[PDB]
């Protein structure tokens, strides 16, 4: 998961 | 429930689970894992946000643990700390  | 709230409409586990109605079932992370960790679906792609800290995450992959991702990207989230403790968050 990564930040938007 | 934490003192601080970014999305009051998503304060309840039941509300957060409801956003996963149209969650793509090809994404390899289950809605209950996300909702339990404070996340709700914002309705585009696999984009989610935490109801407490407003932290936003996408591109969920097999093996991702929503609690572990919550603590690595948004380590000062009040909900995260109340649920898992200062001790869990690097
Ligand atoms: Zn959070």
mmCIF file with all atom_site columns, C-alpha atoms and ligand atoms in Angstrom:
data_model
loop_
_atom_site.group_PDB
_atom_site.id
_atom_site.type_symbol
_atom_site.label_atom_id
_atom_site.label_alt_id
_atom_site.label_comp_id
_atom_site.label_asym_id
_atom_site.label_entity_id
_atom_site.label_seq_id
_atom_site.pdbx_PDB_ins_code
_atom_site.Cartn_x
_atom_site.Cartn_y
_atom_site.Cartn_z
_atom_site.occupancy
_atom_site.B_iso_or_equiv
_atom_site.pdbx_formal_charge
_atom_site.auth_seq_id
_atom_site.auth_comp_id
_atom_site.auth_asym_id
_atom_site.auth_atom_id
_atom_site.pdbx_PDB_model_num
ATOM   1  C  CA  . UNK A 1 1  ? 0.000   0.000  0.000  1.00 0.00 ? 1  UNK A CA  1
ATOM   2  C  CA  . UNK A 1 2  ? 1.254   3.509  -0.660 1.00 0.00 ? 2  UNK A CA  1
ATOM   3  C  CA  . UNK A 1 3  ? -0.007  7.006  0.085  1.00 0.00 ? 3  UNK A CA  1
ATOM   4  C  CA  . UNK A 1 4  ? -2.241  8.769  -2.520 1.00 0.00 ? 4  UNK A CA  1
ATOM   5  C  CA  . UNK B 2 1  ? -13.938 6.181  19.471 1.00 0.00 ? 1  UNK B CA  1
ATOM   6  C  CA  . UNK B 2 2  ? -11.109 8.677  19.229 1.00 0.00 ? 2  UNK B CA  1
ATOM   7  C  CA  . UNK B 2 3  ? -11.321 12.286 20.267 1.00 0.00 ? 3  UNK B CA  1
ATOM   8  C  CA  . UNK B 2 4  ? -10.147 13.329 16.789 1.00 0.00 ? 4  UNK B CA  1
ATOM   9  C  CA  . UNK B 2 5  ? -12.310 12.438 13.766 1.00 0.00 ? 5  UNK B CA  1
ATOM   10 C  CA  . UNK B 2 6  ? -11.811 13.377 10.089 1.00 0.00 ? 6  UNK B CA  1
ATOM   11 C  CA  . UNK B 2 7  ? -14.964 11.640 8.817  1.00 0.00 ? 7  UNK B CA  1
ATOM   12 C  CA  . UNK B 2 8  ? -17.716 11.522 11.432 1.00 0.00 ? 8  UNK B CA  1
ATOM   13 C  CA  . UNK B 2 9  ? -20.023 9.638  9.059  1.00 0.00 ? 9  UNK B CA  1
ATOM   14 C  CA  . UNK B 2 10 ? -17.488 6.770  9.129  1.00 0.00 ? 10 UNK B CA  1
ATOM   15 C  CA  . UNK B 2 11 ? -17.086 6.665  12.936 1.00 0.00 ? 11 UNK B CA  1
ATOM   16 C  CA  . UNK B 2 12 ? -18.804 3.187  13.169 1.00 0.00 ? 12 UNK B CA  1
ATOM   17 C  CA  . UNK B 2 13 ? -17.401 -0.101 11.941 1.00 0.00 ? 13 UNK B CA  1
ATOM   18 C  CA  . UNK B 2 14 ? -20.808 -0.712 10.265 1.00 0.00 ? 14 UNK B CA  1
ATOM   19 C  CA  . UNK B 2 15 ? -20.577 2.512  8.206  1.00 0.00 ? 15 UNK B CA  1
ATOM   20 C  CA  . UNK B 2 16 ? -17.015 1.700  7.086  1.00 0.00 ? 16 UNK B CA  1
ATOM   21 C  CA  . UNK B 2 17 ? -18.015 -1.845 6.053  1.00 0.00 ? 17 UNK B CA  1
ATOM   22 C  CA  . UNK B 2 18 ? -20.947 -0.381 4.084  1.00 0.00 ? 18 UNK B CA  1
ATOM   23 C  CA  . UNK B 2 19 ? -18.523 1.579  1.813  1.00 0.00 ? 19 UNK B CA  1
ATOM   24 C  CA  . UNK B 2 20 ? -17.024 -1.704 0.645  1.00 0.00 ? 20 UNK B CA  1
ATOM   25 C  CA  . UNK B 2 21 ? -20.215 -2.613 -1.179 1.00 0.00 ? 21 UNK B CA  1
ATOM   26 C  CA  . UNK B 2 22 ? -18.543 -2.008 -4.559 1.00 0.00 ? 22 UNK B CA  1
ATOM   27 C  CA  . UNK B 2 23 ? -15.011 -2.946 -3.498 1.00 0.00 ? 23 UNK B CA  1
ATOM   28 C  CA  . UNK B 2 24 ? -13.386 -4.852 -6.403 1.00 0.00 ? 24 UNK B CA  1
ATOM   29 C  CA  . UNK B 2 25 ? -13.162 -8.443 -5.295 1.00 0.00 ? 25 UNK B CA  1
ATOM   30 C  CA  . UNK B 2 26 ? -9.938  -8.881 -7.266 1.00 0.00 ? 26 UNK B CA  1
ATOM   31 C  CA  . UNK B 2 27 ? -8.109  -6.700 -4.696 1.00 0.00 ? 27 UNK B CA  1
ATOM   32 C  CA  . UNK B 2 28 ? -6.353  -9.168 -2.419 1.00 0.00 ? 28 UNK B CA  1
ATOM   33 C  CA  . UNK B 2 29 ? -7.202  -7.438 0.903  1.00 0.00 ? 29 UNK B CA  1
ATOM   34 C  CA  . UNK B 2 30 ? -10.614 -8.174 2.553  1.00 0.00 ? 30 UNK B CA  1
ATOM   35 C  CA  . UNK B 2 31 ? -13.004 -5.338 3.443  1.00 0.00 ? 31 UNK B CA  1
ATOM   36 C  CA  . UNK B 2 32 ? -13.221 -6.473 7.086  1.00 0.00 ? 32 UNK B CA  1
ATOM   37 C  CA  . UNK B 2 33 ? -9.444  -6.170 7.491  1.00 0.00 ? 33 UNK B CA  1
ATOM   38 C  CA  . UNK B 2 34 ? -9.562  -2.586 6.176  1.00 0.00 ? 34 UNK B CA  1
ATOM   39 C  CA  . UNK B 2 35 ? -12.652 -1.481 8.118  1.00 0.00 ? 35 UNK B CA  1
ATOM   40 C  CA  . UNK B 2 36 ? -11.353 -2.968 11.400 1.00 0.00 ? 36 UNK B CA  1
ATOM   41 C  CA  . UNK B 2 37 ? -8.148  -0.953 10.947 1.00 0.00 ? 37 UNK B CA  1
ATOM   42 C  CA  . UNK B 2 38 ? -10.174 2.319  10.573 1.00 0.00 ? 38 UNK B CA  1
ATOM   43 C  CA  . UNK B 2 39 ? -10.279 2.396  6.751  1.00 0.00 ? 39 UNK B CA  1
ATOM   44 C  CA  . UNK B 2 40 ? -13.280 3.030  4.424  1.00 0.00 ? 40 UNK B CA  1
ATOM   45 C  CA  . UNK B 2 41 ? -13.504 2.850  0.606  1.00 0.00 ? 41 UNK B CA  1
ATOM   46 C  CA  . UNK B 2 42 ? -13.685 6.220  -1.166 1.00 0.00 ? 42 UNK B CA  1
ATOM   47 C  CA  . UNK B 2 43 ? -15.185 4.571  -4.265 1.00 0.00 ? 43 UNK B CA  1
ATOM   48 C  CA  . UNK B 2 44 ? -12.384 4.965  -6.809 1.00 0.00 ? 44 UNK B CA  1
ATOM   49 C  CA  . UNK B 2 45 ? -9.794  2.344  -7.666 1.00 0.00 ? 45 UNK B CA  1
ATOM   50 C  CA  . UNK B 2 46 ? -8.761  0.656  -4.387 1.00 0.00 ? 46 UNK B CA  1
ATOM   51 C  CA  . UNK B 2 47 ? -8.407  4.003  -2.609 1.00 0.00 ? 47 UNK B CA  1
ATOM   52 C  CA  . UNK B 2 48 ? -9.173  4.088  1.129  1.00 0.00 ? 48 UNK B CA  1
ATOM   53 C  CA  . UNK B 2 49 ? -8.968  6.645  3.937  1.00 0.00 ? 49 UNK B CA  1
ATOM   54 C  CA  . UNK B 2 50 ? -8.843  6.364  7.740  1.00 0.00 ? 50 UNK B CA  1
ATOM   55 C  CA  . UNK B 2 51 ? -11.903 7.909  9.472  1.00 0.00 ? 51 UNK B CA  1
ATOM   56 C  CA  . UNK B 2 52 ? -9.636  9.310  12.225 1.00 0.00 ? 52 UNK B CA  1
ATOM   57 C  CA  . UNK B 2 53 ? -6.418  10.636 10.674 1.00 0.00 ? 53 UNK B CA  1
ATOM   58 C  CA  . UNK B 2 54 ? -7.630  11.119 7.021  1.00 0.00 ? 54 UNK B CA  1
ATOM   59 C  CA  . UNK B 2 55 ? -4.581  9.170  5.870  1.00 0.00 ? 55 UNK B CA  1
ATOM   60 C  CA  . UNK B 2 56 ? -5.075  7.837  2.327  1.00 0.00 ? 56 UNK B CA  1
ATOM   61 C  CA  . UNK B 2 57 ? -3.705  4.571  0.874  1.00 0.00 ? 57 UNK B CA  1
ATOM   62 C  CA  . UNK B 2 58 ? -4.060  2.700  -2.419 1.00 0.00 ? 58 UNK B CA  1
ATOM   63 C  CA  . UNK B 2 59 ? -2.531  -0.237 -4.328 1.00 0.00 ? 59 UNK B CA  1
ATOM   64 C  CA  . UNK B 2 60 ? -3.316  -2.993 -1.850 1.00 0.00 ? 60 UNK B CA  1
ATOM   65 C  CA  . UNK B 2 61 ? -1.206  -6.135 -2.484 1.00 0.00 ? 61 UNK B CA  1
ATOM   66 C  CA  . UNK B 2 62 ? -1.307  -9.700 -1.311 1.00 0.00 ? 62 UNK B CA  1
ATOM   67 C  CA  . UNK B 2 63 ? 0.074   -9.961 2.183  1.00 0.00 ? 63 UNK B CA  1
ATOM   68 C  CA  . UNK B 2 64 ? -0.570  -6.321 3.086  1.00 0.00 ? 64 UNK B CA  1
ATOM   69 C  CA  . UNK B 2 65 ? -1.773  -6.024 6.687  1.00 0.00 ? 65 UNK B CA  1
ATOM   70 C  CA  . UNK B 2 66 ? -3.963  -2.893 7.044  1.00 0.00 ? 66 UNK B CA  1
ATOM   71 C  CA  . UNK B 2 67 ? -2.842  -2.358 10.720 1.00 0.00 ? 67 UNK B CA  1
ATOM   72 C  CA  . UNK B 2 68 ? 0.839   -2.622 9.776  1.00 0.00 ? 68 UNK B CA  1
ATOM   73 C  CA  . UNK B 2 69 ? 0.371   -0.271 6.789  1.00 0.00 ? 69 UNK B CA  1
ATOM   74 C  CA  . UNK B 2 70 ? -1.593  2.146  9.047  1.00 0.00 ? 70 UNK B CA  1
ATOM   75 C  CA  . UNK B 2 71 ? 1.283   2.282  11.541 1.00 0.00 ? 71 UNK B CA  1
ATOM   76 C  CA  . UNK B 2 72 ? 4.055   2.765  8.980  1.00 0.00 ? 72 UNK B CA  1
ATOM   77 C  CA  . UNK B 2 73 ? 2.442   5.580  7.012  1.00 0.00 ? 73 UNK B CA  1
ATOM   78 C  CA  . UNK B 2 74 ? 0.300   7.299  9.701  1.00 0.00 ? 74 UNK B CA  1
ATOM   79 C  CA  . UNK B 2 75 ? 2.053   6.406  12.967 1.00 0.00 ? 75 UNK B CA  1
ATOM   80 C  CA  . UNK B 2 76 ? 0.522   9.273  15.001 1.00 0.00 ? 76 UNK B CA  1
ATOM   81 C  CA  . UNK B 2 77 ? -3.119  8.355  14.257 1.00 0.00 ? 77 UNK B CA  1
ATOM   82 C  CA  . UNK B 2 78 ? -5.181  8.560  17.495 1.00 0.00 ? 78 UNK B CA  1
ATOM   83 C  CA  . UNK B 2 79 ? -7.401  5.596  16.589 1.00 0.00 ? 79 UNK B CA  1
ATOM   84 C  CA  . UNK B 2 80 ? -4.375  3.441  15.690 1.00 0.00 ? 80 UNK B CA  1
ATOM   85 C  CA  . UNK B 2 81 ? -2.719  4.202  19.058 1.00 0.00 ? 81 UNK B CA  1
ATOM   86 C  CA  . UNK B 2 82 ? -5.917  3.590  21.112 1.00 0.00 ? 82 UNK B CA  1
ATOM   87 C  CA  . UNK B 2 83 ? -6.438  0.244  19.308 1.00 0.00 ? 83 UNK B CA  1
ATOM   88 C  CA  . UNK B 2 84 ? -2.867  -1.149 19.174 1.00 0.00 ? 84 UNK B CA  1
ATOM   89 C  CA  . UNK B 2 85 ? -0.908  0.947  21.655 1.00 0.00 ? 85 UNK B CA  1
ATOM   90 C  CA  . UNK B 2 86 ? 2.144   3.165  21.495 1.00 0.00 ? 86 UNK B CA  1
ATOM   91 C  CA  . UNK B 2 87 ? 4.162   -0.068 21.770 1.00 0.00 ? 87 UNK B CA  1
ATOM   92 C  CA  . UNK B 2 88 ? 2.983   -1.438 18.348 1.00 0.00 ? 88 UNK B CA  1
ATOM   93 C  CA  . UNK B 2 89 ? 3.903   1.652  16.292 1.00 0.00 ? 89 UNK B CA  1
ATOM   94 C  CA  . UNK B 2 90 ? 7.592   1.952  15.309 1.00 0.00 ? 90 UNK B CA  1
HETATM 95 ZN ZN1 . LIG C 3 .  ? -5.601  6.686  10.974 1.00 0.00 ? 1  LIG C ZN1 1
#
